[PDB]
DNA sequence: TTGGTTTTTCGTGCCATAGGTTAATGACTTTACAGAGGTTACGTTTACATACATTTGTGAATGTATGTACCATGAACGTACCATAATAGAAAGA
């Protein structure tokens, strides 16, 4: 039990919720824990920080949509978070394998 | 000419110096419970005078008690309506 079950409700966020970026503002509302709330957990449970873990999170999420054979790769971003093309190109600094040819795998 | 690795700023995230509301046991203090002490107005126990009753003798009410000496010699002394048929009894002729 960390700051009243935050852990069990940050998943369940972050599963239901859609392609609406996190920031403080943002998940500090409903979120029922704000800034400190959510600042202990990052660097305890996780260890890193949001613009990294929630861009891995994407990434990993958009591997398997790769694979499911959509030709419309500029929606492919935009449905998980990415709210620009070229922030999603991303991709470059971690994996540093093509779009397209990840695409084609 | 176009895709991707490399590099630098920059707002954002993490760490550290400051300074204030407010949990701690307490010390409170206030209310409540526990201690004896003088006073009140009864409740039980006791003696004493007078009263209804109840216990005695005495004057009247009834009640059995034995008899009355001219002559009195049998009757119901006034009852009563008379229905109808099962079962025996004492005799009489069969």
Same mark, same amino acid.
């Given at each position: 039990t960390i700051s009243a079950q935050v852990i069990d409700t940050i998943v369940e966020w972050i599963d239901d919720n859609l392609h609406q970026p996190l920031r403080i503002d943002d998940i500090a509302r409903?979120? *029922?824990?704000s800034k400190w709330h959510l600042q202990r957990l990052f660097l305890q449970?996780? *260890?890193?920080?949001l613009g990294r873990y929630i861009r891995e999170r994407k990434l990993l999420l958009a591997a398997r949509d790769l694979r499911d054979?959509?030709?419309?790769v500029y929606d492919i971003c935009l449905k998980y978070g990415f709210d620009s093309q070229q922030t999603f190109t991303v991709f470059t600094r971690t994996f540093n394998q093509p779009p397209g040819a990840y695409r084609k795998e």
């Open positions: 409903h979120a *029922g824990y449970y996780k *260890g890193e920080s054979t959509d030709q419309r």
